From a paper:
The deposition of H3K36me3 occurs co-transcriptionally when the methyltransferase SETD2 associates with RNA polymerase II. Here we present three cryo-EM structures of SETD2 bound to RNA polymerase II elongation complexes at different states of nucleosome passage. Together with functional probing, our results suggest a 3-step mechanism of transcription-coupled H3K36me3 deposition.
We stalled the complex at a position that is known to trigger nucleosome transfer upstream of the Pol II (bp 64 of a modified Widom 601 sequence). We obtained a reconstruction that showed Pol II at a resolution of 2.85 Å. In State 1, FACT binds the transferred hexasome in the region of upstream DNA above the Pol II active center cleft. Approximately 20 bp of DNA covers the histones from SHL − 0.5 to SHL + 1.5. FACT is bound to all histones and the DNA, covering a total of ~5200 Å2 in buried surface area. Based on CXL-MS data, we placed residues 266–315 of RTF1 into helical density on the surface of SPT16. In State 1, the catalytic SET domain is occluded from binding the hexasome by the presence of FACT. SETD2 is now poised for methylation, but FACT occludes the catalytic SET domain from binding.
Author numbering:
A (entry chain e): 61 to 136
B (entry chain a): 41 to 136
C (entry chain j): 462 to 498
D (entry chain k): 356 to 430
E (entry chain g): 16 to 106
F (entry chain Z): 273 to 318, 335 to 396
G (entry chain Y): 2 to 117
H (entry chain f): 25 to 103
Amino acid sequence: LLIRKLPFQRLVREIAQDFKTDLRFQSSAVMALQEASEAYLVGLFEDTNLAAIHAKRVTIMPKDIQLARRIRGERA
Amino acid sequence: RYRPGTVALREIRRYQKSTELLIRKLPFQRLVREIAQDFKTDLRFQSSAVMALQEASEAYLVGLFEDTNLAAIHAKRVTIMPKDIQLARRIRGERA
Amino acid sequence: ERTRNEMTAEEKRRAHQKELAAQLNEEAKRRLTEQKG
Amino acid sequence: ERGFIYVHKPPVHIRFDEISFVNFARGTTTTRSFDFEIETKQGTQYTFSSIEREEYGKLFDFVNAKKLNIKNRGL
Amino acid sequence: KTRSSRAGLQFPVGRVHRLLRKGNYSERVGAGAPVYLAAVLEYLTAEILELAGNAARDNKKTRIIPRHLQLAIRNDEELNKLLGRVTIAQG
Amino acid sequence: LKPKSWVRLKRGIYKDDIAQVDYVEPSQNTISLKMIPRIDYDRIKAPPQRLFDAEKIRSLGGDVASDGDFLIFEGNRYSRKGFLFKSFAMSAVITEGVKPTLSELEKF
Amino acid sequence: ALETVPKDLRHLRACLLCSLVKTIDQFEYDGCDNCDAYLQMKGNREMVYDCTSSSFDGIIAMMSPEDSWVSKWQRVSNFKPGVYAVSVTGRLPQGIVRELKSRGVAYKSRDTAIKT
Amino acid sequence: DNIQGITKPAIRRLARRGGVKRISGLIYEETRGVLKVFLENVIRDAVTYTEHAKRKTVTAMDVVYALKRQGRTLYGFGG
Amino acid sequence: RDNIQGITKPAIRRLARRGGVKRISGLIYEETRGVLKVFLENVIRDAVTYTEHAKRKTVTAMDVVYALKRQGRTLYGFGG
Amino acid sequence: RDEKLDKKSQAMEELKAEREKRKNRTAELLAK
Amino acid sequence: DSLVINLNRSNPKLKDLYIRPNIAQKRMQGSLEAHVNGFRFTSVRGDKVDILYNNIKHALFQPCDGEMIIVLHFHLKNAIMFGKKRHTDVQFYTEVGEITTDLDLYAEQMEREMRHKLKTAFKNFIEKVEALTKEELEFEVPFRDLGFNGAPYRSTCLLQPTSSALVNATEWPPFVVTLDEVELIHFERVQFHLKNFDMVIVYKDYSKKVTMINAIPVASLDPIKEWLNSCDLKYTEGVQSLNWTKIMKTIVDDPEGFFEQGGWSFLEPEGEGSDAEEGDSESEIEDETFNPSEDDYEEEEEDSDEDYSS
Amino acid sequence: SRKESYSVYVYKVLKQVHPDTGISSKAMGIMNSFVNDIFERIAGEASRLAHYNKRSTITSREIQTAVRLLLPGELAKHAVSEGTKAVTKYTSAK
Ligand SMILES: [Zn+2]
């Protein structure tokens, strides 16, 4: 656990709004999301550090994340 | 310039609506048989299966080189070095 | 049926691009034939 | 067989005798991957990052076979 | 009338249904499943083929070729996504 | 050893000039302080008190370092509007016995 | 055992729940002997800055919590033998206190000092 | 605007957890962007599975499917 | 002649040039073969896996097709 | 769909508008 | 010839400015002022750097929107000496925030303020200069949603179009393409199986090399064409990537015969019925244009009418 | 064995959209391949939904979900549309 549960839930309900009103989430789902959310960012940062390493740097940059996701095929 | 080398190769870019296999089919087919043999004997290889593998691998290796180029580019390098292939494979997570 | 969103962006653009190709070749020939000196 | 050596630049050599303690931190490859910590008796610390979960067990088996002190061995 | 012809569809609904029944997708299969599915197939098929014939025109041809399908899928932002990692085989 | 109050100074030439805390790192070891610089401006070589802001110091030379409205100058004279935000060890400054009261209300 | 005692005298800080006193690096390295399975203050420094406090007063050596007065006055009779601070200042976030409460862990501040 | 609510330290702590040594402030802008894109797809899928189940409040069962369907699968649960 | 060299450096050089890769270390060509072999090995294994259910002792494009699917390399241009 | 297309088209329109301004301006001032 | 400092006038100015490239071995701050006929950047160490307004091929302004720096990019018609080196490209910028964090509203808000503050100050400097310059130096602002990922030199960056150029000034070295000089564009490696592609720029003076913009992602294919279309830029696609140095000398040596062979039409993928080569190089593949034989249709009657429950 | 295919109907549809156009066996093979691929993607996903219900039977309802999940934007709108039309078209009897 590393993000504040409120802003996280607020964001979940907020984006839910863009798809559909009425939507709210049982605690189990929002927790499961954060549980998934953290795992994804963890993996991505590890990967990004591999790029950092590969680029002979320690200060990661967005392009490191971009490349990692780019190579990962996260985008369309 | 109407002379050869100019016309064909220039136009071949446009004549090349074809999808010519980049690895030599027989040199590759032999390797298929070879690796196939490495797995198991009695394996008849349909040319269709040979083509299926060949075409997939060529695009696939080109794919690998897409990532490898990125990673070279990533490292501010033009020449790819095996570390890039490795980086790419590691990041793709497409490792055995 | 007839579910396509709209004419493809290329089809619209094609006339202008095709146009540009003609324009380009004429334009290219003078500039370049003139530049050849 | 009797030490650890980091090959190529910066080249560095380690002997099991110079090791104070080491540990396989939760690494950078997977939640079960590892990074290897080393601190020398000289107080000089070395750490090797980003290593697959697969190499965790082998190095885990290896250091116990070398019987060196691992920070998490008391766990 | 064939189930397809009931639906006026070209697609063989019995085949789609038969594929699912024998294909181990489920223990039983209701008619609405293959019916909806067969219609969807013709729709996307037409969606592509519509572009393909257009591409054929855009290729000076009355004969569609694989080369035309490549232009369709990459120019169509949806097929571009639906067929994003797919491989087309051709000598 | 805790932040957020208005206090009195003890050591150096920086004797008893009142300040407050600006922003907090959780370690509770030191307190950041809204202070007035005591520099000579690095000019005797090629003691005082005067608030100074990173500008005539730039003609003598030295470290001019801006962090926007937050500044650093001539050897980490952490300064803003000519005031130091350098932190002091909470024991080294006399912190207690101020308590902002009805009469006190306007300084910081 | 003595692993709970300051190994080094540099930068000592006290756990803020059970007031156990250890070095900046001992908490970073080892965590709290009575609350790591309950606190998880081990391995990180931002966490150290939050949980482990530099503001503590006096030290108490626990020898026989079962038969001792100081063991009672200091709220340590339920701990293992070690050195604890008489009073540590500060307070925990509005989350872990609830997590602790959920487990039946009642956070009472070790802050024995009277305020002015 | 709650993506702005995903605190820099929260992200920062995950980066430390991912062994990153250093970070450039743009990572926050970028990290928030990444978080949205992941969330957008997971929720849309979560929404759709819930929509199919004829419900308006999402359950862990539904999110498991949304992640599992994307290969981003969660662990520790059964039924 | 040994088929591992059958994936000649120029055959590789063509693919890398197509993967947009410009200069190529000699070292690459060798790893490419390994990668390709690793790639093929996984694929062929699966093709055989399919072939065994079919009680066949002949490898078909169908097995490869059914295999490339399973690896996220779905292939069009085969079957009926 | 239309919102992002409009955002992109808008950037394109602005570009087109600015190009035209510059086109008209460039010819006029040099023409003088 | 000079610069002529606009003495005793309210010469617009900006002060949080890092010049790029550095004059000396290491970077310096300074302030940029607009004068009678050019700019001047004066370092905090007293160095003077002057830019005639005319010698500026382009003035492009990069707001710090999504960028850790606010930048004024100068693309020059001629290179100028920084003493150490000569450069056709120059920048003035300043850091937006913490770039070197080693592992909150006030800080975050100060970022919002500081950006706006700087953003405004620069925006004001621009307007003051545009007014001063009789607008002869309109600061093109890169149309960010019209930018795309690519690599003009060595590293991946977001290329962005401006009213008259395609550039990426965030990174260094700076990338600037004056669209006035673009003869043609070719999208090499464009193919369905690729995930990325490349772009080549042909210049109007063929004595100068083409420029590549490697590995641009294919998802940007249609948007880039459209941008190019809107710029009146002719482009062409090609799965192949043949030698431009050869193609240039070829056409440089014999442009007459080149144009006679339809010139640049050689890149045309023969999409639509250009009468000159109406039949391209095509032939029937090996098929009878898939025509299902009369006997294959007959199995349809077993679509047995079982009214399986809705 | 007797070969199975959709190429017949693909051509019928080709003519239904472009009667004036024909197609080569390779392009036909691609389209026929596509039919097989997409059918299984949806067939698998429709099975998972039925499986999540812990049920023996799959319906159009699972399809609508799977279609919206697998098909992007427009394709989902139209597949919902054309699919709803096609359902209705052989629903009117009973
Ligand atoms: Zn404790």
